[PDB]
Nucleic acid binder design. Sequence first.
RNA 1: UUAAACC
Length: 174
Amino acid sequence: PLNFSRASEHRNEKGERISMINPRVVLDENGISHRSRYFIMLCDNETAIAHAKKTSIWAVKKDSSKRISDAYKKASVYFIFVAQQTYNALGYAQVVSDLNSTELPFWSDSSHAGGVRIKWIKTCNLFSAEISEIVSHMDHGSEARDGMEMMYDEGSRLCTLINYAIMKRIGRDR
RNA sequence: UUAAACC
């Protein structure tokens, strides 16, 4: 079972922090991998998520746009989509363009900085108690804030849990 | 709906 209480204590022989799931993955002092970075999208709008599952365009919020665009410079960047009120996992996707003002989804509003293209990896409408728990403690033990970056081990565990449910025919949406 | 990466 994953426990972050001692995550800072997982270290290699050089003193670098390493992942609790895969000890070969070197992390910064925030638990983030320079190679693979994960952001949560807390979805409150059925129209937006259904349109994004069809068209693969997402609107990024002003408050998280700079950090996401900076992460896209040298890492693979993933968005994990979670329904805000129920914490159902809706899927996860890789960001395959940077922020731009040329291609916006029609549902974007003044909260959004611009658009990105995504490539869906899995889609679902899934309840999992461990996904719920990870989202509920993502901000230092308190609930995730929309657009926040999470730790490598949180992103990787969420992808594993989504994949596992889909392969068991649980929470599929297609 | 075969995560990616690392091995």
